[PDB]
Design a protein around this ligand. Structure first.
Ligand code: CDL
Ligand code: LMN
Ligand code: LMN
Ligand code: T7X
Ligand code: T7X
Ligand code: PSC
Ligand code: 3PE
Ligand code: 3PE
Ligand code: 3PE
Ligand code: 3PE
Lengths: 55, 469, 485, 90, 179, 64, 59
């Protein structure tokens, strides 16, 4: 149960709920697909944030 | 305090009868123990590699040489225990392991001459001590004179030691003819560049080294070690090795020498492949000493080699001592005793040793795997710390020749094991008399050192760091 | 407290030796206690941390006998990640099975044999705990004298030559390993499984260092130039020696190539993976081909183990997360299924007839139907027939080897065929035909043999139906060794 | 509890401290896993498109298919070693 | 760089030293023997020793200097080729083809392992770790042999390894970023 | 720790007494007072080695 | 709780690495005549041979 894939899907959901909280007040199964369209619309990594010496 | 013992001892031994010889040796045994215990606090003199010169730049006392004299005393305590204690109370072992009247005299005079080499600063101290220990090995070889092989061996050792002593004398006076000096303290880092001391110092090192048994001139010493009786040869194999090598490691006069590297490669080669098809146990056992003296000729090329040296010295000394004591113990179980002086000769005579006293084979296996260099045991860290100095200093072909030589030498070490763990038809069940408590405790101490001595490696490196740096 | 536990335990041992002649009950008991202890450690293991969780130092100068709480550390370190603990779980569930495997056949001097077998198991247990290069290396060759004594005293006709080869080839590769370890310890002045990815060596110093470690790995996961001690040390060992060897030593060198080479020889490793692919394809094909003409029966399973380790090495050297994971699954599943095959040939077949030649054995189904059931189930489990863990390892390692080089992946994919030819050629000879006129009928397979077999078959089937059950240990270490800039 | 540890880089830190190096290691690793579940989200969305579309999946999700096949060479586990052993712009 | 070898005169010098070594070893075998031996049994009952010495000397130094002049660089491969020629000469006294091939390849491998470690019995002084810069660089410089850094330049990684497998001049992350 | 050093060196003394008993083809607990004799002797060697390492560390820290 | 206990061990191992590099520096360092040779009589000047000695023999 304790692995990086369940935790990483929960973290990616938490990050798009961080940036766009208006998805909060959609009803329950609309929330699923609104999260998915935000994941397709944006990176949400911060990997280029880590490689500052590269940039 | 050796001088006291010699002066006391020949006075006391001239008045004893021959019934008392063994007890005299017991006395000297305990005497040397209380020179270790009650007098070793002198290590406090040698803090931070403080070095003294004594008798007017004649002797040099540092902590290296203090460790060497402690090692020589410990080994003399073991050997004198082997003479002064009975194995069994049979009428057999009394006619086999019997000390002469003047044996302990020559032992202490040889320990004196061996200490005055490692503690030596000038060349005439070196000379006088070399001849003191050489005449003592002549007489220790010849003292069991009711034996054809020991008489022939003492004559051979006389002539081959005489040549290689005249070569040392020629090198010393040749050094004197170009420098009005006797010290290698004269050299001091600049003279070696502007003066060709190569041929002199290398001829000195060579004349010192051919007495150890380095490779072009090794066979005469293997014959002396096979011809001497089994108690004499455990002493004359060890003491000139550690005394002359502890001189030549402390004095760094053959650093990066091409001749010493040639003879070290040749020594590792001819000792490893020399003792392969051999069926006598002291022969087999002496080519081991040839290879393990090669591993020291390697450190002669080195600058600052005092850790690898001293570790591998006490390694080889404990392992050497134990493997001769184990085959002293196996004489009770052989089906055939020849040759009163040398009762076990052929290595197939220990064939069923696992079925009679299996823990003697546990002993044997431990010390043989430490000879090979197996990592839980003490011989591995000796070979490891030699490699750490060989590779640090650019000897890359020497390293691979060391590795191939150790792999080839593992064959005839394991041949002892291969013989002793085998089936035998008539095995022991019940034997009435016992081996010496005092003397089997020594073999067990020597094993527990070899197996559980890797524990104290970091303690030993820290104490090293303070007293030599 | 902890000393009083031990001299209670030493007194426990002395009393049960005084009242019972054998040791084997206490050795089984200590083995299963060691099992329960390692699984309690797995309960308390943090999978969310990349770091090393259960650390301890031995033989420090401030405390030579015992643990170390110090500002300065020069002893031997020990500790685990998920990669270590995978092989520790595989090791600890095999140690009671090898003590159980010789429960009745060793008659003469039993206590020596069981002490040697448990000692080898404990040394290999501590191999996966180690955290220095010298701490890995000391335990890495503590096995060899115990193996020499075990193979020499117990075995078939030819156990002298097999004991010599298991000391000789292993010592000869592992000395060059010591050369590279000495060079690492004099450049870095640290030997450590923690810091050692932070240090960067020069490229031509790395390519010198990498050779000596790879030569020892070529000897111990036996790749084609020296793959050669392995059939004779198998074919002439006793049963627990064969089982411990082919279940644990080969996977130990598979662990060493991850633990010792991939962190501080990255820039060397990229230059050398075509040479590793030459050697690993060439030890898959040529060994899988040389099994087809074999007269002896344990030698076939030895050559099988060569071909499977050759599949696993191009998984670790693939620079892919899939290849690393598949090599770990292959090592664990092979360590399950291959000692069961060595039990089939050495326990159920050599205890009954005391010969190992293939020409005596024919038609074993009609007197031994469930042995034959075992033989065909294990044959298919060894091939790469899926839902077994062997196919998961072989498939993911072949996929990683296809990513790193597609042409050597294409010619390495034929190992699926080559591994099945000799295995089914042996299996239909053993099961099929009229019963042998040489073999007189003996007992069918007993309860302890069926017990060992059932455990070693369920533990392949669970990994084969769901390989995810041990991803929680490995998801760090599958990303740890990748060098894709 | 869904705890979120802080993000550390390899470039601000001293490598002689081990706390920060181990955290930068785990940070870069977990960020690759976040990247990965973004790729998996688009894959499940694409197979939902294909299953809902039937015959016209060529033109309903041309862009989802192009997005999946463009993300696939670049969204995987890459390893911290290659960035921590080497510095670009040096 | 390098300068071409005197294959002519080094081979003449080698034939001289091999002739002398054969003279000395034949005299040594004469003196260390049994039986009726006189002054001119030194070259009849020698056992073919001068042939060994001179043939090995001519073969090794001819093949070494020729291979170093044909390859126009000096490394241990020339010692490999010259040791192969010496093993050919030492294996022709064995009048047997497989043993001849074994002498060739194994002596060439031993001499190539010799010449790769430096072709020196003894040490090199400045190449040693004792007499070289070691440890960390203390600030950023061209990392020498025997030295350790924390980070390597990526341009050195691209030039030394390549631009292929997983290895690139810019990381995969910042090559794919939104603006 | 000093106590762990003492107990471990006494264990080395017990090991050498046991092994010397078993070379003599005796039982293990043949003479049970030699165990405490050997353990006290090897524990005294451990005492000496511990004190020398302690003085050595103090000399090393006095170079501050 | 585990990152700190690994940083403690890494600090303890880097301390040993610094100590080892130091103790290697310390041996190759040159040393005084009063420490290398005997402490008492610290000058290398011989002034030897004192019976029939000539004035002007010193330099
Ligand atoms: C992994 C480990 C790899 C190591 C393997 C090496 C061992 C190979 C064993 C070969 C063998 O069988 O020899 C037996 C052979 C035993 O003799 P035998 O009783 O007459 O007959 C044996 C068979 O019955 C004869 O049967 P056969 O004739 O059919 O066998 C064919 C051939 C086959 O041997 C092969 O191995 C052929 C392999 C070729 C395949 C290549 C594939 C490559 C991929 O073997 C030989 O007969 C002779 C080989 C020549 C031996 C060369 C020894 C010196 C080499 C340098 C070693 C150091 O050995 C010798 O006589 C050699 C002489 C003894 C040693 C003298 C050493 C002289 C040193 C010369 C100078 C060296 C230079 C060093 C450089 C220093 C720089 C300053
Ligand atoms: C260029 C190379 C040239 C290849 C030539 C083959 C070669 C070297 C093989 C080396 C392999 C290299 C491998 C790569 C490197 C790995 C190192 C071996 O020649 C072998 O060839 C075999 C097959 O042709 C023969 O087997 C046959 O099997 C049955 C039929 O299959 C037959 O019924 C059966 O009668 C045969 O026995 C062998 O008898 C023969 O020895 C050299 O051949 C030549 O030299 C010698 C031996 O130096 C050969 O034998 C010697 O002369 C004999 C009288 O002739 C004497 O008795 C004796 O003095 C000695 O035996 C010669 O004969 C000659 O041919
Ligand atoms: C079973 C496995 C066998 C494995 C054997 C591998 C042995 C291979 C040896 C490699 C090695 C020792 C390294 C060994 C370290 C540990 C080894 C572990 C134990 C090994 C036992 C010996 O390097 C040798 O290589 C030979 C050819 O390869 C050469 O042969 C000869 O060629 C012609 C001469 O001019 C003759 O004309 C011909 O007559 C000879 O033939 C030798 O001269 C050379 O010394 C390399 O060391 C050396 O590398 C060089 C270049 O980086 C380093 O350069 C310095 O540093 C950089 C800035 O400072 C600069 O970049 C660089 O420019 C600078 O100069 C040196 O610091 C030095 O350290
Ligand atoms: C017994 C009883 C007594 C009998 C007495 C009768 C004989 C007396 C003579 C005495 C001789 C006794 C024999 C001694 C044994 C032989 C001694 C011997 O070779 O050392 C050689 C002679 O170094 C010469 O410089 C080379 C010397 C060359 C000599 C030339 C000889 C010419 C003969 C022509 C005919 C030592 O170089 P070495 O190995 O350090 O090598 C040197 C290296 O060459 C240098 O590059 C380095 O600077 C240096 O670091 C080191 O590597
Ligand atoms: C730090 C550097 C490392 C050093 C390592 C030390 C190595 C050797 C250290 C030795 C110090 C030895 C301590 C041991 C003292 C205890 C000890 O076991 O008694 C001896 C051995 O006595 C040495 O053999 C005495 C051997 C003396 C050797 C002294 C060497 C110094 C064994 O008597 P044991 O019980 O078997 O046997 C006796 C005896 O057989 C019966 O006749 C009697 O009925 C009864 O007395 C029975 O007890
Ligand atoms: C009351 C005590 C009376 C004095 C006893 C002395 C006996 C001399 C015995 C010699 C052979 C037996 C091995 C003993 C090794 C001792 C190590 C040591 O301490 O040697 C030092 C390091 O050695 C080095 O570099 C390298 C030495 C390498 C040692 C390698 C063998 C390791 C395993 C055996 C030693 C540990 C055994 C401890 C068992 C409790 C150098 O000299 P030290 O001035 O500091 O000596 C001081 C010892 N004192 C205080 C007892 C006098
Ligand atoms: C310009 C100046 C020109 C000088 C001419 C070059 C002179 C080179 C020196 C010649 C050395 C001759 C070697 C020799 O003396 O012959 C070997 C000698 C006789 O051997 P033999 O009687 O045939 O034994 C029978 C074995 N079945 O057998 C012996 O017992 C000799 C013992 C060894 C001699 C010393 C060897 C020194 C070299 C060490 C080996 C190098 C290893 C390198 C790796
Ligand atoms: C004492 C007893 C000794 C017994 C010896 C038994 C045989 C030992 C195994 C044989 C070892 C043979 C080694 C030959 C090496 C020759 C050599 O010097 O290689 C140098 C080479 C770098 O040469 P480089 O100048 O960079 O490029 C030239 C391209 N034409 O470097 C390379 O290219 C790497 C070559 C790797 C060879 C690996 C061989 C297996 C290990
Ligand atoms: C065959 C040849 C190869 C064989 C090699 C075998 C290797 C054997 C090595 C022995 C390792 C001993 C390590 C013991 C560790 C036990 C332990 O950790 O605790 C018990 C006590 C120390 O207490 P502790 O709590 O650790 O103190 C530090 C707290 N921070 O520590 C102790 O008191 C344990 C004392 C053990 C004494 C054993 C002496 C040897 C006996 C045989
Ligand atoms: C103040 C802090 C410092 C304190 C340190 C000072 C230490 C002083 C020494 C303390 C002495 C306590 C003695 C405890 C050990 C006793 C050993 C012993 O007697 O074991 C005997 C046992 C067999 O007993 P037994 O019933 O006689 O069997 C033979 C009958 N035929 O045989 C065995 O059990 C074998 C035991 C050998 C084990 C060796 C390795 C483990 C250690």
């Amino acid at each position: 149960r304790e692995d990086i894939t369940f935790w990483a899907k929960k973290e990616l959901d938490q990050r798009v709920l961080d940036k766009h909280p208006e998805i909060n007040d959609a009803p329950e199964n609309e929330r699923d697909a609104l999260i998915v369209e935000r994941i397709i619309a944006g990176d949400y990594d911060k990997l280029a944030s880590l490689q500052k010496k590269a940039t | 305090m050796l001088i006291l013992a010699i002066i006391s001892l020949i006075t006391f031994v001239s008045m004893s009868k021959l019934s008392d010889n063994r007890a005299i040796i017991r006395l000297i045994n305990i005497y040397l123990i209380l020179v270790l215990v009650l007098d070793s606090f002198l290590y406090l003199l040698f803090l931070n590699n403080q070095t003294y010169t004594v008798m007017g730049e004649l002797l040099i006392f540092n902590s290296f040489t203090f460790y060497i004299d402690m090692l020589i005393y410990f080994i003399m305590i073991v050997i004198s225990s082997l003479y002064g204690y009975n194995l069994y109370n049979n009428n057999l072992y009394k006619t086999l392991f019997e000390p002469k009247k003047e044996l302990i005299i020559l032992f202490l005079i040889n320990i004196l001459g061996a200490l005055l080499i490692v503690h030596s600063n000038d060349f005439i101290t070196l000379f006088v001590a070399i001849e003191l220990q050489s005449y003592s090995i002549y007489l220790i070889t010849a003292i069991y004179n009711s034996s054809y092989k020991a008489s022939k061996a003492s004559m051979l050792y006389f002539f081959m030691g005489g040549i290689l002593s005249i070569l040392i004398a020629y090198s010393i006076n040749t050094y004197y003819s170009v420098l009005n000096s006797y010290t290698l303290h004269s050299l001091d880092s600049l003279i070696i560049n502007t003066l060709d001391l190569n041929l002199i110092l290398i001829a000195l090192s060579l004349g010192l080294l051919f007495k150890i048994g380095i490779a072009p001139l090794h066979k005469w010493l293997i014959s002396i070690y096979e011809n001497t009786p089994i108690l004499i040869t455990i002493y004359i194999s060890l003491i000139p090795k550690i005394s002359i090598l502890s001189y030549l490691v402390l004095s760094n006069i053959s650093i990066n020498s091409l001749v010493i590297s040639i003879l070290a490669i040749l020594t590792l080669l001819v000792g490893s492949v020399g003792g392969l098809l051999q069926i006598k146990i002291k022969r087999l056992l002496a080519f081991s000493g040839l290879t393990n003296a090669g591993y020291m000729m390697l450190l002669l090329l080195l600058n600052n080699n005092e850790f690898s040296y001293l570790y591998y010295i006490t390694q080889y000394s404990i392992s050497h001592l134990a493997i001769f004591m184990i085959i002293i113990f196996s004489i009770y179980y052989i089906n055939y005793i020849n040759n009163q002086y040398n009762p076990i000769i052929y290595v197939n005579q220990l064939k069923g040793l696992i079925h009679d006293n299996a823990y003697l084979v546990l002993s044997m296996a431990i010390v043989v795997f430490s000879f090979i260099g197996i990592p839980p045991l003490l011989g591995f860290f000796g070979k490891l710390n030699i490699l750490m100095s060989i590779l640090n200093n650019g000897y890359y072909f020497i390293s691979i020749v060391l590795i191939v030589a150790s792999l080839i030498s593992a064959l005839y070490y394991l041949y002892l094991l291969n013989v002793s763990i085998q089936d035998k038809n008539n095995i022991l069940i019940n034997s009435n008399e016992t081996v010496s408590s005092v003397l089997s405790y020594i073999l067990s101490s020597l094993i527990i050192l070899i197996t559980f001595g890797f524990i104290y490696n970091s303690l030993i490196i820290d104490i090293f760091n303070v007293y030599f740096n | 407290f902890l000393t009083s536990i031990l001299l209670s335990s030493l007194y426990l041992f002395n009393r049960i030796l005084a009242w019972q002649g054998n040791v084997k009950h206490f050795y089984l008991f200590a083995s299963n206690l060691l099992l329960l202890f390692i699984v309690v450690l797995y309960i308390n293991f943090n999978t969310f941390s990349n770091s090393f969780q259960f650390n301890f130092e031995l033989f420090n100068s401030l405390n030579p006998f015992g643990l170390s709480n110090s500002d300065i550390s020069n002893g031997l370190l020990f500790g685990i990640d998920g990669l270590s603990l995978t092989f520790i779980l595989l090791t600890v569930l095999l140690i009671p099975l090898t003590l159980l495997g010789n429960w009745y056949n060793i008659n003469f001097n039993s206590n020596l044999y069981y002490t040697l077998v448990l000692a080898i198991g404990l040394v290999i247990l501590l191999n996966f705990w180690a955290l220095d290069y010298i701490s890995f290396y000391i335990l890495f060759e503590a096995t060899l004298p115990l193996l020499f004594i075990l193979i020499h005293i117990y075995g078939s006709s030819d156990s002298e030559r097999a004991s010599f080869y298991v000391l000789m080839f292993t010592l000869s590769g592992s000395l060059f390993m010591l050369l590279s370890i000495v060079v690492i310890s004099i450049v870095l002045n640290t030997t450590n499984f923690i810091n050692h990815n932070l240090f960067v060596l020069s490229l031509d110093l790395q390519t010198i260092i990498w050779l000596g470690l790879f030569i020892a790995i070529m000897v111990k996961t036996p790749l084609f130039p020296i793959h050669v001690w392995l059939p004779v040390v198998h074919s002439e060992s006793p049963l627990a020696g064969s089982m411990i060897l082919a279940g644990l030593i080969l996977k130990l060198a598979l662990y060493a190539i991850l633990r010792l080479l991939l962190p501080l020889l990255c820039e060397a490793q990229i230059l050398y993976t075509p040479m590793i692919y030459i050697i690993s394809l060439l030890t898959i094909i040529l060994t899988s081909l040389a099994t087809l003409r074999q007269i002896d029966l344990k030698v076939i399973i030895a050559y099988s183990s060569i071909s499977h380790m050759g599949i696993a090495i191009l998984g670790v050297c693939s620079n892919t997360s899939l290849g690393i994971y598949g090599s770990i699954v292959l090592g664990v599943a092979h360590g399950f299924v291959s000692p069961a095959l060595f039990l089939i040939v050495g326990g159920i077949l050599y205890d009954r007839y005391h010969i190992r030649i293939v020409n005596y054995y024919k038609g074993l189904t009609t007197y031994m139907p469930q042995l034959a059931t075992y033989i065909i189930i294990l044959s298919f489990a060894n091939i790469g027939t899926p839902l077994t863990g062997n196919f998961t390892g072989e498939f993911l390692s072949l996929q990683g080897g296809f990513i790193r080089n597609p042409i050597i992946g294409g010619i390495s994919c034929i190992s699926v065929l080559l591994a099945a030819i000799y295995q089914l050629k042996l299996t239909n000879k053993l099961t099929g035909g009229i019963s042998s006129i040489y073999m007189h009928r003996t007992n069918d397979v007993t309860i302890r043999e069926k017990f060992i077999m059932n455990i070693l078959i369920i533990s392949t089937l669970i990994i084969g139906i769901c390989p995810q059950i041990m991803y929680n240990l490995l998801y760090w270490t599958v990303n740890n060794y990748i060098y894709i800039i | 509890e869904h705890q979120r540890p802080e993000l550390v880089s390899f470039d601000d830190i001293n490598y002689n401290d081990h706390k920060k190096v181990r955290e930068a290691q785990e940070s870069y690793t977990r960020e690759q896993f976040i990247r990965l579940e973004a790729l998996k989200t688009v894959r499940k969305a694409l197979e939902k498109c294909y299953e809902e579309s039937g015959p016209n999946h060529f033109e309903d999700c041309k862009n989802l298919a192009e997005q999946y096949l463009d993300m696939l060479p670049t969204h995987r586990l890459q390893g911290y070693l290659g960035y921590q052993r080497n510095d670009p712009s040096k | 760089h390098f300068h071409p070898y005197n294959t002519l005169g080094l081979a003449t010098q080698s034939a001289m030293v091999g002739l002398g070594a054969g003279v000395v070893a034949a005299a040594a075998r004469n003196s260390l023997a049994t039986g009726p031996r006189n002054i001119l049994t030194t070259f009849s009952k020698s056992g073919g020793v001068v042939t060994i010495f001179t043939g090995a000397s001519i073969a090794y130094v001819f093949t070494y200097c020729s291979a170093a002049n044909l390859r126009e660089r000096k490394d241990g491969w020339n010692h490999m080729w010259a040791g192969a020629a010496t093993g050919a000469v030492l294996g022709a006294r064995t009048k047997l083809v497989p043993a001849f091939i074994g002498w060739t390849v194994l002596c060439g491998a031993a001499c190539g392992l010799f010449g790769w470690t430096g072709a020196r019995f003894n040490a090199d002084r400045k190449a040693s770790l004792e007499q070289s810069p070691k440890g960390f660089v203390q600030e950023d410089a061209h990392q020498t042999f025997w030295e350790v850094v924390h980070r390597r330049p990526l341009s050195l990684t691209v030039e030394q390894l390549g631009e292929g497998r997983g290895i690139n001049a810019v990381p995969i992350a910042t090559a794919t970023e939104a603006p | 720790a000093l106590f762990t050093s003492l107990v471990g060196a006494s264990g080395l003394g017990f090991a050498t007494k046991f092994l010397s008993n078993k070379i003599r083809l005796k039982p293990a607990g043949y003479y049970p007072l030699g165990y405490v004799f050997s353990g006290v002797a090897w524990a005294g060697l451990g005492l000496v080695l511990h004190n020398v390492h302690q003085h050595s560390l103090e000399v090393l820290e006095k170079k501050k | 709780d585990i990152l700190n206990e690994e940083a403690k061990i890494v600090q303890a191992l880097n301390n040993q690495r610094e100590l080892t590099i130091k103790m290697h520096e310390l041996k190759r360092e040159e040393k005084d005549y009063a420490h290398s040779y005997s402490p008492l009589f610290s000058d290398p000047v011989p002034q030897g041979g004192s019976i029939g000695k000539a004035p002007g023999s010193s330099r």
